[PDB]
Amino acid sequence: KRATCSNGKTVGDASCCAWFDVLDDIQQNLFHGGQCGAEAHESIRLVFHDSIAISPRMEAQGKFGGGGADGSIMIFDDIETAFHPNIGLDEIVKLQKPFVQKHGVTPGDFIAFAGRVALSNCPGAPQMNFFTGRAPATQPAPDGLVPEPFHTVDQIIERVNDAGEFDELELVWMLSAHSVAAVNDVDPTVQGLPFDSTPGIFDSQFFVETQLRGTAFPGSGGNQGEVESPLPGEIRIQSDETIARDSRTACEWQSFVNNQSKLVDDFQFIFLALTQLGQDPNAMTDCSDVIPQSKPIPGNLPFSFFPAGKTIKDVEQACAETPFPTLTTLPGPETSVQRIPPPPG
Ligand code: HEB
Ligand SMILES: [Ca+2]
Ligand SMILES: [Ca+2]
């Protein structure tokens, strides 16, 4: 059957027991009592920037293409966090390092762990998986491997296809993370502008809101990779805006609107896949029973809605197969999306 940890919990594999002490430590000292706040969002982002930096095409040509989910972004933070796509990630890397040192775990395992635990904090999240077995990187990733907000949809599709054999529909899946996300470094005048009106809730509001006609910048204009957004305080990036309207991806983008089961099943899958880049999944240990049970979305709303002051008339419909769903609109005046201030220091 199962192993029993010193704290009296039971697990599928005895090696998983050490992660309960990591869990308690980060929930209290990294995530401010298990919150879906700035440190959680940064930890989710960090998983992608560690993991996607792998390139089988470069290896085939005799060039080191990076080791994927290997902890390189932490081990070699002075190198990798100075790459422009990794802007702002040295803060979370620095917050995470003490825990890795204290608990004697691999940097790559800890990054995957912290991302899973972060998502567990966000109502609506899938039940996140956690596998161990990522040896420390011995070489930093090359630059040019992490997508930018100003890149073409073509080059982003190509990049994820190379990194993980991900198709263009799976690209849409992994962008679900922007449902619990804010932007600190794109607008030099303001930090913490969310991508959707519910950055604390893993829902499909990101997929709704990116489909709306953009009307204004939330702060300054003229920032590379930024386009007009539909709501005060919400930011929109060019890549997301284009993927939402591109004939290859627009139908998948819309499919998440008012479809919670598809959202969570697809994201659960793709997040695990990201955390196993550069690894042999058969060689890894399943420690998924350490991750907290995800919480349902509270309250009494339909799963997807238009934000207040928006209706079907504000949607730029892009899926030729299926009209955009006629959602309910939240009552009241158009409200400003509140910023998520990044960690002090
Ligand atoms: C994980 C998963 C994921 C994925 C896949 C992604 C994908 C992406 N993305 Fe992301 N992001 C994210 C998650 C993510 N993401 C998050 C979580 C965030 C937030 C952070 C904070 O809040 O801090 C972001 C954020 C972000 C930002 C902001 C930053 C700064 O400012 O610093 C940007 C620009 C981006 C982009 C992007 C792109 C281009 C792509 C393509 C693919 N993003
Ligand atoms: Ca890496
Ligand atoms: Ca959200």
Numbering used by the authors: -1 to 343
Q: Can you quote the paper on this entry?
A:
The lignin peroxidase isozyme H8 from the white-rot fungus Phanerochaete chrysosporium (LiPH8) demonstrates a high redox potential and can efficiently catalyze the oxidation of veratryl alcohol, as well as the degradation of recalcitrant lignin. However, native LiPH8 is unstable under acidic pH conditions. LiPs and VPs can directly oxidize nonphenolic lignin compounds through surface-active sites. Oxidation of high-redox-potential substrates, such as VA, is mainly catalyzed by the surface-active site Trp171 and its surrounding residues.
Only three predicted mutated sites, A16E, A55R/N156E, and H239E, were estimated to provide a stabilizing effect on the overall protein structure compared to native LiPH8 [based on their calculated Gibbs free energies depending on variable pH conditions]. The crystal structure of the variant A55R/N156E-H239E LiPH8 was solved; this variant showed both enhanced acidic pH stability and long-term catalytic activity. The crystal structure of the variant A55R/N156R-H239E LiPH8 showed the formation of salt bridges, as expected. The side-chains of A55R and N156E had two alternate locations on the electron density map. By contrast, rigid hydrogen bonding and a network of salt bridges were found between residues surrounding the introduced H239E mutation. The average RMSD at 300 K for the overall structure of native LiPH8 (RMSD: 4.81257 Å) was also higher than that measured for the A55R/N156E-H239E (RMSD: 3.19034 Å). We also found that a helix containing the active site Trp171 showed a significant decrease in fluctuation (yellow-colored helix). The combination mutations of A55R/N156E with H239E demonstrated a synergistic effect in both acid stability and long-term catalytic activity. Tm was assessed at different pH values and the variant proteins had increased Tm: native LiPH8 had a Tm of 49 °C, whereas the A55R/N156E-H239E variant LiPH8 had a Tm of 51.0 °C at pH 5. Herein, with the introduction of salt bridges at the appropriate positions, we recreated an active lignin peroxidase variant (LiPH8 variant A55R/N156E-H239E) from ancient ligninase (native LiPH8) that exhibited remarkable stability under extremely acidic conditions, such as MnPs, and still retained an exposed active site for lignin.
